[PDB]
Every structure is written in C-alpha cells, then in structure tokens.
C-alpha cells in the first residue's frame, strides 16, 4: 500500500480529479504570488520615486 | 396503533405515488435554526456570593 497524499499517481489511480485540482492550486497560488510581490514593490517604488 | 395507521398510510402512497418512509427514526441532531434577539440585549448574570 503505497501512500496517497505522499506520492502522486496513486491518488490519480483512485481519484483522477486530484491532478486537475492540484495544478489549479499551483496556478492560482503562483498568480497570487506574482501579484503580491509586484504590489509590495509598487508601494515602495513611488515612495522611493519621492526621495 | 402504528401497524394500523402504518398499513393504511402505506397504500396511501400507492394511489398518490410517493416514498413516505414510514420507518421510524431516533432523534436526529437539531436543525440549523435561527434565534432572534429582537430589540433587547442579552441578560448579564453572574454568580451570587456566599452567605450562610
């Protein structure tokens, strides 16, 4: 008994939706990560443009 | 009484076409209901001191 949640592709043997659930929560947490790092730079960008 | 008002209610579902589920159940957990504290605010009670 290889472990689901510990490797892929046993989950996908038991649950095919688990992959398309998983790259969606890699795609969207990377677009919330590109957003916030760009946003936090854009606050101190104009604050550094001031001085 | 139930066997009596059970069998007649069983053939009432034959003429009407339903799934009335005459088997009895234990008490389920209480339904997600909604209380209303209309106007007022709840009463603050606090433990009384000891006097003999």
């Amino acid at each position: 008994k290889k472990n689901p949640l510990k490797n892929l592709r046993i989950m996908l043997k038991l649950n095919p939706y688990a992959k398309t659930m998983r790259r969606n929560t890699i795609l969207r947490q990377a677009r919330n990560h590109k957003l916030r790092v760009d946003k936090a730079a854009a606050a101190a960008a104009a604050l550094q443009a001031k001085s | 009484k139930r066997v009596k008002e059970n069998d007649q209610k069983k053939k009432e579902a034959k003429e009407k076409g339903t799934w009335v589920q005459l088997k009895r159940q234990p008490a389920p957990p209480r339904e997600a209901h909604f209380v209303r504290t209309n106007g007022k605010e709840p009463e603050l009670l606090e433990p009384i001191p000891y006097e003999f």
Binding site: - | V35, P42, E43, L45, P47, I48, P49, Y50
Partner: protein, 175 residues
C-alpha cells in the same frame, strides 16, 4: 477546569429550548474565563444551572466567541471578586491585580490563589472583573505603582548558568 496556560475571555449566550408552554426564552449571557472554547461552553452550563433551572439537555448555547479587551497596550488596574472554597468552609473575596488585559489579570488570579491560598482551580468561582481607575485601589501592593516619575534599580542579578561554560575561570559579578 485546569486553567491550562494563559486564559482567554469568552462571551457565551444561550437559552433553554422553546417548550410548548414557553416560546422565546430570554437568552441569558455570561462572561466565561476558560483556556479554550470547549471548556468555555462547559462552564456556562455549570454556572447557569446554579442560577436558573436550565441544563445542557433542555438548553443550547447560541453564541461562543472570544471577547477581547480593547486596549491591549494600556496598563489597567483590575479588581475581581472571588468565591473560593477552603478546607474548612467557603469565603467571598475581593482581590486586585494590574495587567494589560482582562484574561491576563484573571490568569494572574488563578496562579495567585494557588500560591497563597492553595486553592485548586475547580473550587474558585469568578464573580465579576472590571478595570478600576486609580485612587480607588485599596491594596497597597497595587497602589505603590501609581507614581509618576517612578524609578528603581535592579539589584543582585542572577541567570544563565550552564548556558555558558559551566566551567569558567571567572567569578560572575552580580552587578
């Protein structure tokens, strides 16, 4: 109750069930000090059953949230009322502390009742807690920190042994 760790104030309201005789009972409110919310709604049915004819089977709680002090930064003076039990009889007690939060002042009670009076935390009942302002304190241990331009040094400092070499060639100054 164990009074495990630092406590946490909860506002718990609840009401006995609507009977066919009684519709809409008035939904009482208490102020439970407990380490988590599961103990907090367990002490509500301890205190309500001593005050009204209610119990957990024929009642339910309809709120249990952490209610927290507004001013966690301002230093406040707390006076609380106690109903502990002793080994012989039971006594009422007023008792004053001085903390930045309400749940930290009642935590400072349970520790202090066990320290001075050896009273285990199941035998003591908090009646009410509120901030008092200065010049209404009666305890001279709380009163002595009401001093603008207060100052005091730290004599005879001792700490961090074995942290450094247990074996040193150096007699450690206590300043």
């Amino acid at each position: 109750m164990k009074a495990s760790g630092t406590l946490r104030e909860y506002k718990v309201v609840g009401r006995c069930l609507p009977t066919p005789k009684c519709h809409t009972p008035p939904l009482y409110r208490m102020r439970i000090f407990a380490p988590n919310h599961v103990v907090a709604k367990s002490r509500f049915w301890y205190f309500v059953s001593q005050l009204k004819k209610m119990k957990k089977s024929s009642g339910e709680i309809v709120y249990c949230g952490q209610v927290f002090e507004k001013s966690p930064l301002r230093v406040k003076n707390f006076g609380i009322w106690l109903r502990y039990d002793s080994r012989s009889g039971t006594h009422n007690m007023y008792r004053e502390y001085r903390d930045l939060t309400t749940a930290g002042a009642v935590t400072q009670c349970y520790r202090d009742m066990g320290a001075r009076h050896r009273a285990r935390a199941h035998s003591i009942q908090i009646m009410k807690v509120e901030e008092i302002a200065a010049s209404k304190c009666r305890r001279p241990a709380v009163k002595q920190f009401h001093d603008s331009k207060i100052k005091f040094p730290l004599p005879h400092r001792v700490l961090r042994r074995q942290h450094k070499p247990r074996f040193t060639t150096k007699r450690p100054n206590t300043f």
